[PDB]
Amino acid sequence: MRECISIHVGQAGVQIGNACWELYCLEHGIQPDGQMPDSFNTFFSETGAGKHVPRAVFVDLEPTVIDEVRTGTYRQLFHPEQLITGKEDAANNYARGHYTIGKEIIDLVLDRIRKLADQCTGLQGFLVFHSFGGGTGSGFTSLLMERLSVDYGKKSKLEFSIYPAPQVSTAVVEPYNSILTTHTTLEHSDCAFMVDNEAIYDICRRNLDIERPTYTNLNRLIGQIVSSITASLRFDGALNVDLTEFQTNLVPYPRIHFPLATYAPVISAEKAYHEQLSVAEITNACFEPANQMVKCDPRHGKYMACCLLYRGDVVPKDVNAAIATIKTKRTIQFVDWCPTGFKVGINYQPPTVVPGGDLAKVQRAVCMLSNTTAIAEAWARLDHKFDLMYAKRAFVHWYVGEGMEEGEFSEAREDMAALEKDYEEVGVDSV
Amino acid sequence: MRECISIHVGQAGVQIGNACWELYCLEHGIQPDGQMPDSFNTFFSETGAGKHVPRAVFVDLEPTVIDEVRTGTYRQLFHPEQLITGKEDAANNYARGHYTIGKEIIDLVLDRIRKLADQCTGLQGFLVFHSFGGGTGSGFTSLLMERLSVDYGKKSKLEFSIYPAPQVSTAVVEPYNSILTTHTTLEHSDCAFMVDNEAIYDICRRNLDIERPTYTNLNRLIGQIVSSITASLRFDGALNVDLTEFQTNLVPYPRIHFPLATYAPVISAEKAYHEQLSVAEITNACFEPANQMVKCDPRHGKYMACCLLYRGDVVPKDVNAAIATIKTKRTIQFVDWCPTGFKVGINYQPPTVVPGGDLAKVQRAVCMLSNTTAIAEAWARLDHKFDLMYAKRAFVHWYVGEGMEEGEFSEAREDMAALEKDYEEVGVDSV
Amino acid sequence: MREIVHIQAGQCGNQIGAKFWEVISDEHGIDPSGNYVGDSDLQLERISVYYNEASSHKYVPRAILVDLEPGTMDSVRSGAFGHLFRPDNFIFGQSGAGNNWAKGHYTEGAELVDSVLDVVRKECENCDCLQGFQLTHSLGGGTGSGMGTLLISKVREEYPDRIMNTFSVVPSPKVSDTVVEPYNATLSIHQLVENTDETYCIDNEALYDICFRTLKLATPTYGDLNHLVSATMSGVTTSLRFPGQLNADLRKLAVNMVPFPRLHFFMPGFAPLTARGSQQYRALTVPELTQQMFDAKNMMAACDPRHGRYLTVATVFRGRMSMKEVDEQMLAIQSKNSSYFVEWIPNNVKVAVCDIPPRGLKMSSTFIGNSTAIQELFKRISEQFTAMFRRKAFLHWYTGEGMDEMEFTEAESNMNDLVSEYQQYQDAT
Amino acid sequence: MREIVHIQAGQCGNQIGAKFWEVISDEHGIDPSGNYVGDSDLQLERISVYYNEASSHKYVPRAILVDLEPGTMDSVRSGAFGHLFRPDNFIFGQSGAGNNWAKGHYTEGAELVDSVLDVVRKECENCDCLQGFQLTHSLGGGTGSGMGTLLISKVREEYPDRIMNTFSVVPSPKVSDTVVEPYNATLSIHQLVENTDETYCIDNEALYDICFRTLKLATPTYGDLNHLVSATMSGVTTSLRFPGQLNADLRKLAVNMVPFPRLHFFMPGFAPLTARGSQQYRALTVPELTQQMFDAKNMMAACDPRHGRYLTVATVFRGRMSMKEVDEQMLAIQSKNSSYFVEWIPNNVKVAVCDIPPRGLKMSSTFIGNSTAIQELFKRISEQFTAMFRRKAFLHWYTGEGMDEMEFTEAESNMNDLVSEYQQYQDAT
Numbered sequence A, B: 001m002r003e004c005i006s007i008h009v010g011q012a013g014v015q016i017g018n019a020c021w022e023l024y025c026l027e028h029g030i031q032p033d034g035q036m037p038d039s040f041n042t043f044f045s046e047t048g049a050g051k052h053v054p055r056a057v058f059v060d061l062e063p064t065v066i067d068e069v070r071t072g073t074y075r076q077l078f079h080p081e082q083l084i085t086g087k088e089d090a091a092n093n094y095a096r097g098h099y100t101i102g103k104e105i106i107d108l109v110l111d112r113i114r115k116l117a118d119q120c121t122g123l124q125g126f127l128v129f130h131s132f133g134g135g136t137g138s139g140f141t142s143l144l145m146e147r148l149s150v151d152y153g154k155k156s157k158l159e160f161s162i163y164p165a166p167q168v169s170t171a172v173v174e175p176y177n178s179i180l181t182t183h184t185t186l187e188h189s190d191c192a193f194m195v196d197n198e199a200i201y202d203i204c205r206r207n208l209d210i211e212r213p214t215y216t217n218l219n220r221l222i223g224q225i226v227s228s229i230t231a232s233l234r235f236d237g238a239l240n241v242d243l244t245e246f247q248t249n250l251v252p253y254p255r256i257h258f259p260l261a262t263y264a265p266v267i268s269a270e271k272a273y274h275e276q277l278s279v280a281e282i283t284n285a286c287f288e289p290a291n292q293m294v295k296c297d298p299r300h301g302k303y304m305a306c307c308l309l310y311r312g313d314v315v316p317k318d319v320n321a322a323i324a325t326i327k328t329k330r331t332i333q334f335v336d337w338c339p340t341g342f343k344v345g346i347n348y349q350p351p352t353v354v355p356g357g358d359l360a361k362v363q364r365a366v367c368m369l370s371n372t373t374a375i376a377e378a379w380a381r382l383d384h385k386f387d388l389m390y391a392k393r394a395f396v397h398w399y400v401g402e403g404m405e406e407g408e409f410s411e412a413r414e415d416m417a418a419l420e421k422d423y424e425e426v427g428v429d430s431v
Numbered sequence C, D: 001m002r003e004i005v006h007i008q009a010g011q012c013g014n015q016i017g018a019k020f021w022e023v024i025s026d027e028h029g030i031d032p033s034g035n036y037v038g039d040s041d042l043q044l045e046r047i048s049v050y051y052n053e054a055s056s057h058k059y060v061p062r063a064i065l066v067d068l069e070p071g072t073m074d075s076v077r078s079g080a081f082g083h084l085f086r087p088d089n090f091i092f093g094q095s096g097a098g099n100n101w102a103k104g105h106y107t108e109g110a111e112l113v114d115s116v117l118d119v120v121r122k123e124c125e126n127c128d129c130l131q132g133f134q135l136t137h138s139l140g141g142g143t144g145s146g147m148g149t150l151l152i153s154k155v156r157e158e159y160p161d162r163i164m165n166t167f168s169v170v171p172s173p174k175v176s177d178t179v180v181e182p183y184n185a186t187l188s189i190h191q192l193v194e195n196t197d198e199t200y201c202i203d204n205e206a207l208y209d210i211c212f213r214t215l216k217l218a219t220p221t222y223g224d225l226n227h228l229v230s231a232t233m234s235g236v237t238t239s240l241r242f243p244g245q246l247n248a249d250l251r252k253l254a255v256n257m258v259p260f261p262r263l264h265f266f267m268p269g270f271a272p273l274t275a276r277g278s279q280q281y282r283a284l285t286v287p288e289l290t291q292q293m294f295d296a297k298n299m300m301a302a303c304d305p306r307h308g309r310y311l312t313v314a315t316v317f318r319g320r321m322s323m324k325e326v327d328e329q330m331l332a333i334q335s336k337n338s339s340y341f342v343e344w345i346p347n348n349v350k351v352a353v354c355d356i357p358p359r360g361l362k363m364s365s366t367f368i369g370n371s372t373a374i375q376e377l378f379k380r381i382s383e384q385f386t387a388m389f390r391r392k393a394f395l396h397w398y399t400g401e402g403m404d405e406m407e408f409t410e411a412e413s414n415m416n417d418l419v420s421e422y423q424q425y426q427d428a429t
């Protein structure tokens, strides 16, 4: 049972999945041919011949990205009837992925899901992968996850979106294509993670000691988190942290489903020996504002409900003992209305090494998922930055000419500001 | 337990720790690779791989000094996250150490301490190492000792400062950046040892029979004192001289924490056979004014409370017998209001030999830490030397332009003259 | 595979097009006969953006060559790549319009332009997903400014969804080789605003300025300025043909650059530009070459970008980059001259990288700035044109053809509204 | 890594610059092509104080060569290190100011300075932590004192925190080669007090006196005087590039020497200076060369330090020293002529050592004295100026250019206040 499929939208969606599925082949011994030379069935619906088809569908409207995966290595692993591919990129445009071109290729993607959702006895949930930086990653995903929640109501669906940074930016229209996305991902999504891209450069420069990291050095650090979140579905320990359990162990309301991921340890191979990596160091490093995976300071906000997911050679004695330091005698203030603490997700399997040579092997890890109210300062940029652009009506005619009504931005901002008011609402108890 | 970290700062501070940590590896069998081929945990937080990491924070604002350590030998012993390094040297300017540049790199040194003070079950105290001769040793330490006294209130903090010599001099603003730092170390510090730099030449001239000593023949002698002070925390004997039940054998009042170190014997290798180095001559050598570590005569002043810290093959029979000659049958007059004498810190471990070939091995050693009032003559040669320069207002425009108020020198001289009045106040009992 | 038919109108556009395909046939490793002799197969997997296939391993470029002036066809028919083009595509009249606009648009050009659209519809039929039309012409001349805008308004009638490029060499006040240059320039722009959706107003003054100051050549003998505008013409579409870490199509550029549908006049720029033998070996290093790429000297349009704040900026890199060093440098540029950008477009510098450099370098990066200092390019022409229109000199060569006299007063107001529109955002916020 | 961009104004400042980088490229082991052929890695680990990198193991010196007249550019292009410098840095005008100050500062030099600061800003941009600027020029000349002080006052406007060095060659009353030497000298120092942070008044008389008396050469044919000022130019920044037992930066000398913000005028000194083959073998052994260093003969400025008491003294050593033998010897100097030092600065002799000597010795040590006997230098010039300014001779070559006549009485009072300021501490306490 316990199968879980992962869909991938956009240039960010495939380039993560090119290196995300690079990691799962090492975490099960699966060759690049798909031929293993136990229980991999949460991510690999195998065939009788000895192959292993990964349960993923790669979607992009532009062919220039998937053809790297379709022709380089791992070209025999995937199933060629599932790498869905358009012709026009429609890039940096929400309406050209949600109304014009993405309307055409939805019926090939959503048909391919039902050719994979009919091989799952126990379907845990969907794992989308996109960016909020325009094109299909926000335009087509808003069309896809609206279409999925009609056909699949009572089913969880994670979201590993790449939220756009305040300062480091690529698209000019990058704030327009994120206010138009949160109207979708408030309703249809569930526990939509939003990592950033600038905050990894503040991780891959000091915590990881390499200079000038490429996009293949952040799409491996984003691969380990989706590994250790779903490390409970396929291994042992004292877990009970399957995706339906930690879902309503995390969100307090149906509108506070925006946690942040945080990995630890991420220490390089040169300082892997000069520090004992024990469980008190591993959790205390996991709470630094210089170690989060989004550009926000959690010391400014207050945690609602964390969720630590350990894996490797730990024991629940000193996990529960090192927690009480961070629980009580610290100044990382929790919210008042829940004193129970946080989930503990101990797993047995240690994390592995992708052989590209980025971070050396360890014995312990943690992917803490705090549902803090410091995400209200991540949307405090784009509530202002988009409003600074929309005041002059810049770039609107590339959306109002594609099918998008001009009042949608006045609706999306009105919704996304009421969410930010709702996020700052649950931060106080006493008068 | 009983761990004790040691921060270093200045051109003097790293150059001592380059040779002080050279000694501790010999006193525990630690290789230069940090891999011992019992109880060293007061100076080494080991890892599970068989390595050993020294618990020291080498800081300097100038990169050209730590890069000697970071590239030559002992480059694998330390941890690269703790060798904190600025860019500008903060050239002999107390305001560039306390206001301008030191303000920037305080938040990295103070962050590395809490990544080391959280690995300590029992923390005995801090061991700073700087010089009063300008720059970061006086400017950045004044911003550091003021910083640690907020976060770590009830904690001892030793200080092995180098005082500016009276006649031998290196800086021109040596008297300017020493009145400015004693306003810090009068309050925030605790048992601030102030060895001199000229007086160790007059030990390396006659007692040690070498000629033209470098800074490697002079920092070995300052490393042996910090060895046998902390020889109670990691060896055995009749000690009970840990750093909190020893420092209340030193201070009679909260402003008289300025003892002087004195080591004995320092007899060279060729002179090692022509003298029975026994406890009568070993104790009597500590009270020679040609054998102190500060250029001052204790025969002029009166001792308040010594602290004789033996080590090696002694027995407390003749220790208490050889003391009574020095106690009564001498003219080294004690102050009247404490007739109990002084401590005795017998330890079993003999001192070792740094293989540079400076002083041959012995069986006994002392580090007597006398709280004499002969330090008041080490400040009247600075009170006059500073006020001779400040009368013409020379060099003040290199401080008032850097973020320092001009009235601070009229405050620091006013403070340190009232200390000298206070240090001479407790010198008389009967009328 | 996105497709772009490329229309070398005029003669200067034919002069820079003969050095444009010489870049690309080297960039894909295509022999002058038309075969393939390239080494890496990553350059072969997508050549259909700029090429077709014959009944062998022999490719033929999707090119339409249009010039009323003949004989310059016989230059490129007898040059180094005469056997490369399709000989059916060579469309040329007989007379050659002599720096006239009314001739070449109304009288002479209308008797030729129907032969072109029987070829541009022949080439639109062999393309699976058409992306757009490039056309390279010289503004201010006779053919490329009068046949070209007739050709665009006939193409945009038939293809209102495909994108349009225009590498118009504008006239310059210092280097002018035509007395009726401020007449053919201001007549073309009115029929260039409403139809094309992104131009590239390169100039011929700053190209002469580069080969003396930056490139430090002795004699710029027209095989360089027609080459230097070919490098920044391959550089726009170097992401359509090569797998990049972060790639950008032509639709991605025109959705990132124009904030209003009338503001498509871009000043391109290409870097690195070394010396001939000195900086390419000794002095220049090639990370963080955006300091060269943003300079006033290394522009194509002869305008001072310090005289007006940028609206949007696209920097298409090519080399094997490192995306922190691309983006951390890009923030430092935006924070340095923070008054030189529009306030209400925050974080405007669009990046785009590739994986294959030009053959002979390691890194390279074009730059496509949509400045507002392009109003100085149009304030010179609308000064010179309003001087000659007072005396109404040189008017019987245009009113002699089927062109009214009120067409000039209509075309000047359509230009002066554009300079009023571009000045509307230089001072406002 | 602290960085020092190195300008070279004037002709003499270019004549000593070609023998300055000749010293350093030997000191770091750099071939004249620009590569690295050094043995010890402690050289290569910090060369970024004075250099850059190429796209190979090849380094290029951070130099900006400015002179109003060419030919001296053709000397360093055709010299031993022609292919070392960056050819973009070679900034040179056309005319060359003929020993005029108003020309070269007001008229001619203003047309060149904006071409310089587009290369200063390029070199300031490729540096991580800039330490300061050092420019080597010649006072008394035309383009080393007119262009030079214009270049300083434009740089200190843009970088008011970086240090400033100036290795100016002051005129001498005996060896004078210019009739308007007491005009261009006394104009520079008004614009040299307010902007430079620490100068180095090297005279050209004592350099002719060293090569006869101390060095005992036969004919000092300008490859020595313009070399000996480079050996003390590397001696100041020999602690920035090499690990020492006790090292001092350019900020350290600029904070240990000046007691007041006006008193930055240093007379440097270098030792050991043997004979060519005689004293380096027959007589001299090299510990305690300070008694050579404090001599009146072994100075650079042509002033007598016995005629005026020292204020502060920096002795940067270089050899493998022994810090007792450095400091105990340094006390014996301060106790010998105890009346030759100022009273209210006790223990003024700042010391600093290194670990790597110059190639060809074992020990070496410069000396940077901030005396008050430098008032004897300015008392000569303000004597010669006040003689010529009575008759107002040679004024139509300055007032003919854009310079007034009250500027001289304003500039002479600024010098006579400086000599009034340096005399204020010679006799007081």
Ligand SMILES: Nc1nc2c(ncn2[C@@H]2O[C@H](COP(=O)(O)CP(=O)(O)OP(=O)(O)O)[C@@H](O)[C@H]2O)c(=O)[nH]1
Pocket: C010, C011, C012, C013, C015, C016, C067, C068, C069, C070, C072, C096, C097, C098, C099, C100, C138, C139, C140, C141, C142, C143, C144, C145, C169, C171, C177, C178, C204, C222, C225, C226
């Ligand atoms: N960028 C370049 N422009 C050129 C070059 N040679 C000429 N020209 C430019 O093009 C202009 C003239 O070329 P045209 O094609 O406009 C002449 P016309 O349109 O009348 O077609 P023909 O008479 O058949 O030549 C001239 O003013 C220049 O501005 C060149 O080599 N490169």
Ligand SMILES: Nc1nc2c(ncn2[C@@H]2O[C@H](COP(=O)(O)CP(=O)(O)OP(=O)(O)O)[C@@H](O)[C@H]2O)c(=O)[nH]1
Pocket: D010, D011, D012, D013, D015, D016, D067, D068, D069, D095, D096, D097, D098, D099, D100, D138, D139, D140, D141, D142, D143, D144, D145, D169, D171, D177, D178, D204, D222, D225, D226, D229
């Ligand atoms: N240290 C050296 N000084 C020199 C040398 N040759 C000349 N000089 C000195 O420098 C002075 C030369 O004047 P300049 O260098 O300033 C020549 P100026 O800038 O005035 O005009 P140009 O000749 O057009 O460069 C001369 O009076 C001498 O005092 C030399 O070889 N070395």
Ligand SMILES: Nc1nc2c(ncn2[C@@H]2O[C@H](COP(=O)(O)OP(=O)(O)OP(=O)(O)O)[C@@H](O)[C@H]2O)c(=O)[nH]1
Pocket: A010, A011, A012, A013, A015, A016, A060, A061, A062, A065, A089, A090, A091, A092, A093, A131, A132, A133, A134, A135, A136, A137, A138, A162, A164, A170, A171, A196, A197, A215, A216, A218, A219, C245, C246, C247
């Ligand atoms: N963290 C991370 N982000 C990426 C990576 N690759 C692309 N991105 C993000 O992707 C964003 C751009 O959106 P795209 O992924 O190109 O979405 P798209 O426009 O539909 O893709 P195309 O249509 O093919 O252009 C940028 O803001 C990048 O931040 C990556 O490897 N790692």
Ligand SMILES: Nc1nc2c(ncn2[C@@H]2O[C@H](COP(=O)(O)OP(=O)(O)OP(=O)(O)O)[C@@H](O)[C@H]2O)c(=O)[nH]1
Pocket: B009, B010, B011, B012, B013, B015, B016, B060, B061, B062, B065, B089, B090, B091, B092, B093, B130, B131, B132, B133, B134, B135, B136, B137, B138, B162, B170, B171, B196, B197, B215, B216, B218, B219, D245, D246, D247
């Ligand atoms: N006793 C002793 N003193 C030293 C030694 N080395 C340097 N010193 C002293 O240290 C002072 C040097 O300055 P630092 O304390 O390091 O502070 P600083 O001014 O910032 O110096 P830098 O960090 O190098 O810029 C001098 O006054 C010397 O007296 C040494 O080996 N032994």
